[PDB]
Enzyme design. Sequence first.
Site, PDB file in Angstrom:
ATOM      1  N   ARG A   1       0.870  -1.159   0.000  1.00 45.20           N
ATOM      2  CA  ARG A   1       0.000   0.000   0.000  1.00 45.20           C
ATOM      3  C   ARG A   1       0.910   1.212   0.000  1.00 45.20           C
ATOM      4  O   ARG A   1       2.097   1.103   0.308  1.00 45.20           O
ATOM      5  CB  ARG A   1      -0.894   0.005   1.239  1.00 45.20           C
ATOM      6  CG  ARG A   1      -2.091   0.936   1.137  1.00 45.20           C
ATOM      7  CD  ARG A   1      -3.093   0.436   0.109  1.00 45.20           C
ATOM      8  NE  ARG A   1      -4.444   0.917   0.383  1.00 45.20           N
ATOM      9  CZ  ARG A   1      -4.729   2.145   0.803  1.00 45.20           C
ATOM     10  NH1 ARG A   1      -3.953   3.163   0.456  1.00 45.20           N
ATOM     11  NH2 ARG A   1      -5.789   2.356   1.570  1.00 45.20           N
TER      12      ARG A   1
ATOM     13  N   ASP B   1      -4.431  -0.428   8.917  1.00 47.59           N
ATOM     14  CA  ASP B   1      -3.519   0.565   8.370  1.00 47.59           C
ATOM     15  C   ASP B   1      -2.199   0.672   9.141  1.00 47.59           C
ATOM     16  O   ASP B   1      -1.193   1.121   8.586  1.00 47.59           O
ATOM     17  CB  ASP B   1      -4.216   1.935   8.300  1.00 47.59           C
ATOM     18  CG  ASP B   1      -5.533   1.889   7.511  1.00 47.59           C
ATOM     19  OD1 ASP B   1      -5.647   1.045   6.592  1.00 47.59           O
ATOM     20  OD2 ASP B   1      -6.451   2.696   7.805  1.00 47.59           O
ATOM     21  N   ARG B   2      -2.192   0.254  10.407  1.00 50.19           N
ATOM     22  CA  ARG B   2      -1.017   0.441  11.263  1.00 50.19           C
ATOM     23  C   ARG B   2      -0.627  -0.808  12.054  1.00 50.19           C
ATOM     24  O   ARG B   2      -1.246  -1.119  13.070  1.00 50.19           O
ATOM     25  CB  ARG B   2      -1.240   1.604  12.243  1.00 50.19           C
ATOM     26  CG  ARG B   2      -1.258   2.993  11.604  1.00 50.19           C
ATOM     27  CD  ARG B   2      -1.677   4.061  12.611  1.00 50.19           C
ATOM     28  NE  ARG B   2      -2.943   3.697  13.244  1.00 50.19           N
ATOM     29  CZ  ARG B   2      -4.143   3.990  12.745  1.00 50.19           C
ATOM     30  NH1 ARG B   2      -4.241   4.668  11.611  1.00 50.19           N
ATOM     31  NH2 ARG B   2      -5.244   3.603  13.382  1.00 50.19           N
TER      32      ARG B   2
ATOM     33  N   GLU C   1      -3.702  16.698   5.346  1.00 50.86           N
ATOM     34  CA  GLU C   1      -3.233  15.309   5.349  1.00 50.86           C
ATOM     35  C   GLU C   1      -2.403  14.996   4.113  1.00 50.86           C
ATOM     36  O   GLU C   1      -2.676  15.507   3.018  1.00 50.86           O
ATOM     37  CB  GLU C   1      -4.415  14.339   5.375  1.00 50.86           C
ATOM     38  CG  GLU C   1      -5.202  14.360   6.657  1.00 50.86           C
ATOM     39  CD  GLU C   1      -4.417  13.802   7.827  1.00 50.86           C
ATOM     40  OE1 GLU C   1      -4.711  14.203   8.971  1.00 50.86           O
ATOM     41  OE2 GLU C   1      -3.512  12.967   7.607  1.00 50.86           O
ATOM     42  N   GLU C   2      -1.387  14.160   4.296  1.00 55.38           N
ATOM     43  CA  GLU C   2      -0.703  13.525   3.177  1.00 55.38           C
ATOM     44  C   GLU C   2      -0.524  14.458   1.980  1.00 55.38           C
ATOM     45  O   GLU C   2      -1.213  14.326   0.971  1.00 55.38           O
ATOM     46  CB  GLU C   2      -1.490  12.288   2.748  1.00 55.38           C
ATOM     47  CG  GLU C   2      -1.570  11.195   3.820  1.00 55.38           C
ATOM     48  CD  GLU C   2      -2.673  10.177   3.544  1.00 55.38           C
ATOM     49  OE1 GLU C   2      -3.585  10.487   2.743  1.00 55.38           O
ATOM     50  OE2 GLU C   2      -2.630   9.065   4.125  1.00 55.38           O
TER      51      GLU C   2
ATOM     52  N   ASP D   1      -7.834  17.473   2.868  1.00 53.52           N
ATOM     53  CA  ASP D   1      -8.680  17.906   3.961  1.00 53.52           C
ATOM     54  C   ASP D   1      -9.571  16.709   4.281  1.00 53.52           C
ATOM     55  O   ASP D   1     -10.412  16.320   3.476  1.00 53.52           O
ATOM     56  CB  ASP D   1      -9.507  19.119   3.526  1.00 53.52           C
ATOM     57  CG  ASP D   1     -10.056  19.917   4.693  1.00 53.52           C
ATOM     58  OD1 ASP D   1      -9.924  21.158   4.669  1.00 53.52           O
ATOM     59  OD2 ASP D   1     -10.635  19.318   5.623  1.00 53.52           O
TER      60      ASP D   1
ATOM     61  N   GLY E   1     -13.241  19.624   3.955  1.00 50.14           N
ATOM     62  CA  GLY E   1     -12.926  20.034   2.598  1.00 50.14           C
ATOM     63  C   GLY E   1     -13.040  18.983   1.510  1.00 50.14           C
ATOM     64  O   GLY E   1     -12.492  17.889   1.623  1.00 50.14           O
TER      65      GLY E   1
ATOM     66  N   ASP F   1     -11.337  16.178  -4.512  1.00 46.79           N
ATOM     67  CA  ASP F   1     -11.287  15.163  -3.448  1.00 46.79           C
ATOM     68  C   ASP F   1     -12.355  14.065  -3.644  1.00 46.79           C
ATOM     69  O   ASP F   1     -13.149  14.119  -4.583  1.00 46.79           O
ATOM     70  CB  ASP F   1     -11.423  15.824  -2.065  1.00 46.79           C
ATOM     71  CG  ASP F   1     -10.672  15.065  -0.970  1.00 46.79           C
ATOM     72  OD1 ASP F   1     -10.764  15.466   0.223  1.00 46.79           O
ATOM     73  OD2 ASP F   1      -9.988  14.066  -1.305  1.00 46.79           O
TER      74      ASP F   1
HETATM   75  C1  LIG Z   1      -8.398   8.751   6.805  1.00 47.83           C
HETATM   76  C2  LIG Z   1      -7.126   8.906   7.640  1.00 47.83           C
HETATM   77  C3  LIG Z   1      -5.886   8.568   6.828  1.00 47.83           C
HETATM   78  C4  LIG Z   1      -4.929   9.762   6.817  1.00 47.83           C
HETATM   79  C5  LIG Z   1      -5.709  11.014   6.409  1.00 47.83           C
HETATM   80  O1  LIG Z   1      -5.237   7.441   7.393  1.00 47.83           O
HETATM   81  C6  LIG Z   1      -4.763   6.718   6.266  1.00 47.83           C
HETATM   82  O2  LIG Z   1      -5.962   6.315   5.637  1.00 47.83           O
HETATM   83  C7  LIG Z   1      -5.817   5.490   4.568  1.00 47.83           C
HETATM   84  C8  LIG Z   1      -6.945   5.478   3.532  1.00 47.83           C
HETATM   85  O3  LIG Z   1      -6.981   4.579   2.670  1.00 47.83           O
HETATM   86  O4  LIG Z   1      -7.789   6.391   3.607  1.00 47.83           O
HETATM   87  C9  LIG Z   1      -4.708   4.663   4.433  1.00 47.83           C
HETATM   88  C10 LIG Z   1      -3.552   4.702   5.433  1.00 47.83           C
HETATM   89  O5  LIG Z   1      -3.169   3.369   5.780  1.00 47.83           O
HETATM   90  C11 LIG Z   1      -3.932   5.512   6.675  1.00 47.83           C
HETATM   91  N1  LIG Z   1      -2.688   5.977   7.300  1.00 47.83           N
HETATM   92  C12 LIG Z   1      -2.350   5.772   8.572  1.00 47.83           C
HETATM   93  C13 LIG Z   1      -0.991   6.346   8.966  1.00 47.83           C
HETATM   94  O6  LIG Z   1      -3.044   5.184   9.393  1.00 47.83           O
HETATM   95 CA   LIG Z   2     -12.192  15.555   2.334  1.00 46.81          CA
END
Ligand SMILES: CCC(CC)O[C@@H]1OC(C(=O)O)=C[C@H](O)[C@H]1NC(C)=O
Ligand SMILES: [Ca+2]
Lengths: 388, 388, 388, 388
Positions: A36, A69-70, A195-196, A212, A216, A242
């Site tokens: 991922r 995810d973690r 984010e990201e 956002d 957003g 988005d």
């Molecule tokens: C919605 C929160 C989001 C960050 C804005 O968390 C990420 O969400 C997703 C996803 O597919 O939406 C994949 C990653 O594995 C997650 N990252 C972590 C560090 O947990």
């Molecule tokens: Ca959004």
Amino acid sequence: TYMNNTEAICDAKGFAPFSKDNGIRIGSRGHIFVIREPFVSCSPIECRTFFLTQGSLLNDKHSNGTVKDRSPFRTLMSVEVGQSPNVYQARFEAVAWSATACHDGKKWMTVGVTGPDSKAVAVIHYGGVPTDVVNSWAGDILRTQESSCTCIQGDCYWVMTDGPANRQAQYRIYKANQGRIIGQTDISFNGGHIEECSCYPNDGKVECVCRDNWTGTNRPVLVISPDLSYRVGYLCAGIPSDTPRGEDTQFTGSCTSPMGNQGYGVKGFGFRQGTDVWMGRTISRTSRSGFEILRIKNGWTQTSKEQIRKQVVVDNLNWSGYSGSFTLPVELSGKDCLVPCFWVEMIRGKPEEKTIWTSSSSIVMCGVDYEVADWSWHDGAILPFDID
Amino acid sequence: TYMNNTEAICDAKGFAPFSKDNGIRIGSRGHIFVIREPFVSCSPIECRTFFLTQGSLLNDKHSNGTVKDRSPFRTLMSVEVGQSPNVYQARFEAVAWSATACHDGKKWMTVGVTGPDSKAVAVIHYGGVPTDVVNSWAGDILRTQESSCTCIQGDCYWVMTDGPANRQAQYRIYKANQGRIIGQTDISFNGGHIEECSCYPNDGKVECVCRDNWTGTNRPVLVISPDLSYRVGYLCAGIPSDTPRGEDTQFTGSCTSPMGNQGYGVKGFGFRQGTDVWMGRTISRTSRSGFEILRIKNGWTQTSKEQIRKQVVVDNLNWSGYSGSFTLPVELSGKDCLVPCFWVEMIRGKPEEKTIWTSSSSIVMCGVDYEVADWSWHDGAILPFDID
Amino acid sequence: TYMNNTEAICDAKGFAPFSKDNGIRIGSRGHIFVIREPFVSCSPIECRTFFLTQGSLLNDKHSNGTVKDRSPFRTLMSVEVGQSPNVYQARFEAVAWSATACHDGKKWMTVGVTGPDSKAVAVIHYGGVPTDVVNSWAGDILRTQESSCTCIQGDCYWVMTDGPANRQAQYRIYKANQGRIIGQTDISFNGGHIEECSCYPNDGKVECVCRDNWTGTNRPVLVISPDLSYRVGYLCAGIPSDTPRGEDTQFTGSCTSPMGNQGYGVKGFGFRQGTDVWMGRTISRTSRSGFEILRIKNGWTQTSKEQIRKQVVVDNLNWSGYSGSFTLPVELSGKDCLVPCFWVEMIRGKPEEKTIWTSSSSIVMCGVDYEVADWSWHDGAILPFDID
Amino acid sequence: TYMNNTEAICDAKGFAPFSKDNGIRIGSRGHIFVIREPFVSCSPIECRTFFLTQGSLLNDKHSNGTVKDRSPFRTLMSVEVGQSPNVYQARFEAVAWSATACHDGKKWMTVGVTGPDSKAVAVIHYGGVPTDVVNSWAGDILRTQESSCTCIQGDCYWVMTDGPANRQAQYRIYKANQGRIIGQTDISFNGGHIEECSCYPNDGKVECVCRDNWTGTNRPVLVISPDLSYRVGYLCAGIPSDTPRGEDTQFTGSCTSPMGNQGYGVKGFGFRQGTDVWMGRTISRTSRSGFEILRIKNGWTQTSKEQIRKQVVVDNLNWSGYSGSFTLPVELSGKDCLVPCFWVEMIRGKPEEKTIWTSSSSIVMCGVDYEVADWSWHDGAILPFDID
Ligand SMILES: CCC(CC)O[C@@H]1OC(C(=O)O)=C[C@H](O)[C@H]1NC(C)=O
Ligand SMILES: [Ca+2]
Ligand SMILES: CCC(CC)O[C@@H]1OC(C(=O)O)=C[C@H](O)[C@H]1NC(C)=O
Ligand SMILES: CCC(CC)O[C@@H]1OC(C(=O)O)=C[C@H](O)[C@H]1NC(C)=O
Ligand SMILES: CCC(CC)O[C@@H]1OC(C(=O)O)=C[C@H](O)[C@H]1NC(C)=O
Ligand SMILES: [Ca+2]
Ligand SMILES: [Ca+2]
Ligand SMILES: [Ca+2]
């Protein structure tokens, strides 16, 4: 010798395919990591795909529940672009469930963030070895881009988030020389949510388009000088890039405020083009399906939806996901400017398909000087696998 | 330093085995790509096998239906000659369902053509990254050699086709410096048909032997100066080297016109030898079975079938397919001229055998100064596989 | 150019994750060696994981009975740190059922000890090839560190044991230049027992923390000058860092004598920090479960248990095992001193789980200038495998 | 820079283990080639295992009938010593069912002989590419060492056989510069039979110990100056080192004539040591089981069986097979002379075990300055495999 990402962006007309790994299609038989966040990032010599594994391989029982995810098994590794995230070609970069990586013209800095949700530590690697460490300042999931970080004349920058993900959080910049944290700065966006980020070097400054995840449907934006003075806001264009998002018909754009009444989101990218923007997004406006890039006339400094160019990379009948930005150095493209490229993550499996597992493959594209036919480079894997 | 393919061809007497991958025999167990178009091409330092994958691996369900010639999962990758097209040794070159690749003495240029049949784009890679882009000028399957392209003193050339495949189409040359398209030229052959050229550098000029897929059982021919002035026609020899073809007894040769009343064809090669020619072809005259190379006295400039030398590389009881030409640089063979080498693609599976799949392995040969015993280096794989 | 491990140790506050291979989780599907003794060791350019294979691969019948510690199929091989001990990335180093390896700044010396229990021979490899040979002086299982050996200004040192393992044995140092044995020295510790030292370069001298497998729950210690004059004793701290061990409440520390009434033990490590110590150990005091590092105020030169810092690397609910020490050269960390790092071996399978086999994966950590949150990076593999 | 194999041999006392691949034990699961003739040979920088594949992999159906010694799928490939002959690490060297390979200090020359039994062609590769070609002079299975060839100051030499294998045949030497055949010479041994020589550079001259497959249980011998003047005969020692052979008690040695009344044989090696010899051989005198090396006082120039040193490498209860000789250059061992090393091929499967297949693994040893304990490094694989 250090690598100068000083130049502006080559104004570009279309996007042509650069690579495609077919990892998931290959994984049915080969030994491919369940992965991922497959981002791309180049050095004076090579382009690499970085990724996050679940510590497992496709079509094995350990890929079971790789939605989470973690995990402590999560690691950031890398392969040469176009090559699938397979065991025998992968370099270990760092342990990480969130990350970013780039090259200062001399070595690769990578940042792997791991640990307990409460106090996660970010482990800067420069040239492979851990060289610096960043603790969670706010004790709520320290995290990072999940895409390339920028290095302008030897110094590298990137954006971290800490705090919740469904409301206000905090956002810092960080700066380093040879893996040394020699600078940081607080990003004040009250009522915002960053984010990201998908960053790139333009006109000397690193510009970012971010996510956002609060309110957003339009994307946070931020420009960073090497002294850490920043402008932060939103992509002026009145076209929500988005997901989920509203319709293009009903939406008002802002360079200052979040618009729409939608929670959630997904990683995305934009490229300034003087005044215009290139912006990517899924085709579907509610689901992570399809993909396409749009050129908006004066979209960068104003709220218009003039659509000069549009191009489909993946069709609305196929799964997409993350996307992200990087550039081709000067020491590679030969161009006199930083060629804008991007990538698209195409997720498969859970929670939408009959699998214990969740992984993604990619399709990378690059800024060329002509327009390019629309098509779909979809993952193309057949699910479920035998392990269902 | 740039690589000088200025020399003429070493006049050669026989052909000795250079490499053999056994990919398909290995694929039964190992992780080998389902492949096709496995051509060879050398740099000042290494010889490489380039190929087109179906984005899948042998003996996996994804290799199902890998007869289809054009898919979005199709990618051009490469390994060192003799090495099988396996996952863990392969470099990704480009996305492609048609391609060509060569080395200017400094870097590898590769050309991957992908996209929708209507407007396919050709993506020039120089040193790995996309550097230039060629759209379908005629909206009917832009395509290329499926063999090595030539680089004479730093500049590289190659032949593309667009338009239908069963009648008149269009044929262009292209020229580049470090992945930059700095030249093109239209090949006017009305009543002709030029597919998938097999080129090599001779006497300073790049000579090509190609595939008439319209009416010719004899092969288009074309010689190119670095200024893009060309002579195009047909291999003078009165021996049809295409498949399907008529008998050697009943056939009249031309240096100007297509001969025979046969549609279809298959990729093939020839080498000028002063006045003579080396020409390859399948043994069978109706099927892609067997292989053999022929030396024709004055075959290059006249319509004779004098047969000075003949040699079987694969027997008429075994599957062959494509074949193609390349040379050993001077910086490798040590020779004082460009050693003429070639390769043979040996296809297996669909549509002739009990398989869901279609792939090929290869056997490469090289010009030596003596005659070499006839034999058969056949694929040697046992079908069907368990996935039948 | 030679590599100067002259500097002292960077005084360090916490430990941050460096790498994690997930070998065993990956082995369920991929082709991973059944391994043990996975130590780390760096050169001016790369950090490598060295290991001992049972000549077999996980989830194969040959991994059956891989509890046995000494076989003729046993080999020392290596991969880049973080990378799993898989077939296709591994370099063969030597045949060995006990070993050590390090880099003099120019080449890798490795020492593989193999042969019959009665007269085992130790095969010094310098730069790959066998360069020197050390016979069992005492005919009872010649053995070595199972961790990195030290190289101070081009000369490399290490500790071997011979004689029984449940009472008095003999302990020598050895010295070499470019794989040449140019020096040795007898370590006289009557009533002592020195197994598998974990060494590092400090203040010019190589300091070791070792395993008393006779009566000590506290660890042998020894400091070595380049002339082979040594001080040998025990870690002064009154905190037993061995396993099995007694409670911290009931234990008296010594810098001279073994304490406790416990036989057995397990490899372990310590780092001087001026006067203080960093010492690792399993959490469980009777079982090889969990892991944690402790900083003891003046623990290095005195018998106190002042606990300035403590950190959990693996939780008491998960399997650990060996641990060991190495450093990051100056030519890597950029630091002005040798960064103290370590690793932890996490064993799985026999004799505690439902498997015919016994293997381990690892988790490496590094000395940073801040404290780092506690967590557990556990193996994470699901047993048994199909071969049960 | 060219590599000077001018020095004599380091007089050596014992042999210590250098590497062991465990290929067959690994092959049960991994993707390993079914192989044979696994010889070793070093360059100024690396030692490599060369081998002959059956174009297949262990535990696959294509390894069925891999007893057959000569197939068109047969290829010579190589890995780094100690590494198993696995797909993903192997370089293709040449097509071959008989071969030899060595390094002139600049590049690898390899010789792959393939083709029909009647007229086989030998394909010299220098630096990878075919550079010269040697036809069967006598139309009866042109063949070569199946071990390292020698390169003394840039020029490389080796011994080929042609004619039958159960009576008189012909034996030539060949010489090359950078893959160029610049010299050959006929070896006249009427009543003799020279198969598969094991050569090494000594005192400037390349000495060979070979296989009499006609009547000799003692080994042909031959010393070659760089001008192709030779002495050929038999190893003077009155100890038959061939298999099958008679007893040591009943045997008379000759430096001139073949002794014994035994047909058949097997590849083997010897090292001059001034006047003495090191000679290897299987333990069993009728079967290819076990292995051991013997030092004979004045065995090199006289017919005595004085046994100064003896050492077992593999026990009489385990399968062996071929063995062969090579040296460590000066640019590697550091020694002031060419270290005598050797290897042993340990065959498994057909025709003695329950398998469709036939393959071998190896165990390499090296000349050290001390005696080394006897032991057995046996293949250690468990047959049959699932494919039985
Ligand atoms: C919605 C929160 C989001 C960050 C804005 O968390 C990420 O969400 C997703 C996803 O597919 O939406 C994949 C990653 O594995 C997650 N990252 C972590 C560090 O947990
Ligand atoms: Ca959004
Ligand atoms: C007959 C038309 C031919 C070109 C003259 O098309 C190729 O035909 C074959 C073949 O085996 O005959 C294989 C390739 O996959 C095809 N290439 C593309 C780009 O579709
Ligand atoms: C208790 C004796 C100990 C050394 C003090 O032997 C080692 O014990 C262990 C273990 O897990 O305790 C693992 C190794 O394989 C053994 N090494 C050898 C060379 O046999
Ligand atoms: C007995 C004749 C012998 C040479 C003296 O032939 C070799 O015999 C053997 C063997 O195991 O004895 C293995 C090889 O595959 C054969 N080589 C070829 C080129 O056929
Ligand atoms: Ca035709
Ligand atoms: Ca103890
Ligand atoms: Ca014999």
